[PDB]
Design a protein around this ligand. Structure first.
Ligand SMILES: [Fe+3]
Ligand SMILES: [Mg+2]
Ligand SMILES: [Mg+2]
Lengths: 212, 197
């Protein structure tokens, strides 16, 4: 999903609000902040109502301006609440009654997702690969800066996981694929307009193809 | 008009979510309290620090850490949620590694701790992939021209830690002394371990 969440490479932001080893305060800066992660895990592990990937996707589905003005942990409160409503566990009306006011949610999905790709290649370390030049309106774990770009395999995972584009929509056809550490030269991704050396993106097999 | 939607106070919304689920018997006794405790007390960059100090003093473990990070971490019992498949990345005299999750906040929680606010900022998420040298500089870490910066974007299930270079002036230090100078920021890759004057 080509949403505002896909921030890598966006220009115009100011300084990172940190200097190295500065005091970052306690883990949680307010008494509610542990709830989004805790209730996500309840949803995943106790209720079996959704996957972690569905949580990433529901946050991507926040209305764009809403996303941009919302603190991190609050995005997850909104996301988990949305999933609970979508899965029929809660109603928005009971959340608003309990909250004593408006509790706007993420926007409905505009894609049913897609299955794990039928045709993929097992790549080896050292091999040149291109990120498939594909556009996916639903959940995808490929940041746009690497779409269609060429890099070299530095690692093939020894474990396999469900394809996010499927499990992020709660589909039954996510299968399992390894991922690959694909190293791109900074100039491959940003031309002359970068000060870095290389970027390594951890990409599902189904996002990749042999390079020309 | 680009205006924010009307919203109840976030605390009221978060607690409403809790109460709605808890009121339906869907949250086990002490469930969120137990996670809060784990997040605050068990998931810690002190664990990553321990691993680095061990790697620094034990060539065999250093080799295991760099080849099968998961196995290495498992020896300490430090695998956990958002830290089940671990890859440690080695800094060298010609390579500085840095970790981000441009798409959200993905972090090796059990050994680095939950990400800090700044790591999750749009500033860090947008900028470090494209201008890591300038970003580290602004953050107080100067990386020379002769050093390649490599940014790992945490886009899937791999969960990364940086193994920084051991600084000169620490020869013969104990594992405890070495641990002390490996901070959260060293593990994320934005800082280099510092030896006192
Ligand atoms: Fe993330
Ligand atoms: Mg975009
Ligand atoms: Mg209404």
């Amino acid at each position: 999903m080509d949403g505002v969440h896909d921030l890598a490479g966006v220009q115009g932001f100011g300084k990172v609000p940190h200097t190295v080893n500065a005091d970052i305060g306690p883990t949680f800066h307010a008494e509610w902040e542990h709830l989004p992660y805790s209730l996500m895990f309840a949803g995943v592990a106790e209720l079996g109502a959704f996957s972690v990937d569905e949580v990433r996707y529901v946050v991507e589905r926040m209305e764009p301006r809403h996303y941009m003005m919302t603190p991190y942990y609050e995005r997850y409160v909104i996301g988990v609440a949305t999933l609970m409503v979508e899965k029929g566990i809660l109603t928005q009306d009971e959340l608003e009654s309990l909250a004593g006011g408006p509790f706007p949610l993420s926007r409905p999905s505009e894609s049913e997702g897609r299955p794990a790709p039928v045709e993929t290649t097992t790549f080896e370390v050292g091999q040149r690969v291109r990120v498939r030049d594909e556009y996916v309106p639903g959940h995808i774990r490929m940041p746009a800066y690497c779409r269609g770009r060429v890099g070299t395999i530095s690692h093939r995972t020894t474990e396999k996981w469900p394809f996010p584009d499927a499990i992020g929509h709660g589909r039954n056809d996510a299968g399992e694929e390894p991922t690959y550490h694909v190293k791109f030269a900074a100039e491959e991704l940003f031309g002359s307009d970068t000060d870095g050396g290389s970027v390594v993106v951890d990409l599902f097999e189904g996002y990749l193809e042999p390079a020309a | 008009e680009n205006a924010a939607p009307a919203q109840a106070p976030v605390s009221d919304r978060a607690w409403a979510l809790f109460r709605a689920l808890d009121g339906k018997g869907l949250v086990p006794d002490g469930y969120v309290e137990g996670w809060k405790k784990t997040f605050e007390e068990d998931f810690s960059p002190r664990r990553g620090a321990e691993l680095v100090a061990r790697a620094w003093t034990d060539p065999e473990f250093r080799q295991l850490l760099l080849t099968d990070g998961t196995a290495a971490v498992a020896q300490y019992g430090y695998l956990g949620p958002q830290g089940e498949y671990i890859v440690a990345v080695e800094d060298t005299p010609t390579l500085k590694n840095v970790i981000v999750c441009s798409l959200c906040s993905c972090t090796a929680w059990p050994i680095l701790g939950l990400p800090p606010t700044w790591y999750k900022s749009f500033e860090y998420r947008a900028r470090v992939v494209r201008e890591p040298r300038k970003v580290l500089s602004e953050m107080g870490t100067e990386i020379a021209s002769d050093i390649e910066i490599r940014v790992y974007d945490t886009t899937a299930e791999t969960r990364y830690m940086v193994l920084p270079q051991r600084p000169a002036g620490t020869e013969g230090w104990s594992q405890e002394q070495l641990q002390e100078i490996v901070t959260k920021d060293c593990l994320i890759g934005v800082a280099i371990p510092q030896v006192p004057t």
